[PDB]
Amino acid sequence: DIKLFGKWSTDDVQINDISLQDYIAVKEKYAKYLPHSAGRYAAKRFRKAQCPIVERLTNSMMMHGRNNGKKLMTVRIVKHAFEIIHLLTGENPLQVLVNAIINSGPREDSTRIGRAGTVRRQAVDVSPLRRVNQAIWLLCTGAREAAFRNIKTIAECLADELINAAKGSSNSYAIKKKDELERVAKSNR
């Protein structure tokens, strides 16, 4: 009954990991017609787990200073990306979003301990909510950094990393940061 941008439905989207099931939104009742909702998700801790992750990606799309208020700009970037994704793959374009958020977030970080200039870190776990928070950050800055001085638009540069993170490729900027954030993490352990 509820299709995102009136065309993409949510019933066949299947989250893989159990670590991210209670945190990554829409499958059932977070189905919205548009990513724009204008809701008070930052009013309490953990409340933003119950917001549709399409709105999460839209909100982190506008990060740099010249685009900081523009939500109607970034929702059409995501809408135009959800056409290029479907053309280059051929399936529902929401399953690739949860395939990208599952794949991109690290699972072992390093916490900084030392003195003024001295760095002797130590490896810790990663909470799955910080995994969801750092999935979308790496995706969006990969789309941002590889579209800057380039003929490629932001909608193509978002889509060509949002599938490359789902496939687990190491040409995507997101998985290039996750494996190094775990490589320097294992190096202390």
Partner: protein, 139 residues
Amino acid sequence: QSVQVFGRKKTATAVAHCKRGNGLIKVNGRPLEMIEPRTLQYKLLEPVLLLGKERFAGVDIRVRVKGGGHVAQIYAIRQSISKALVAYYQKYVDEASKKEIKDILIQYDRTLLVADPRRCESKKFGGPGARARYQKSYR
């Protein structure tokens, strides 16, 4: 035989007129499709794409709106459409149908019946805005 309710966001006040009609929902004398931010056309059409055209087939909605901006007037129109249909079903239909409308409208998004009460804070001296402060220097 007529309803007048108001919807409200930051400054906008959309006031919806509901009388017994056929189903021509008009914003300031123009259709819902032609309303200019068409990126949020689905945001405008949520209370009719939810409850179907048949629950709106007996009314006729002329929404006037003034104040705010474009996004704030979209969220004021769709609040007053919902709050107008609910008040029409309370004043000229039974309470049961009002409940069966209200639970779907609340289940989608509560900001279709309850106003969003947050407004802009005041600027203070010492900085560029409410919370932010001017940059300071040392020595």
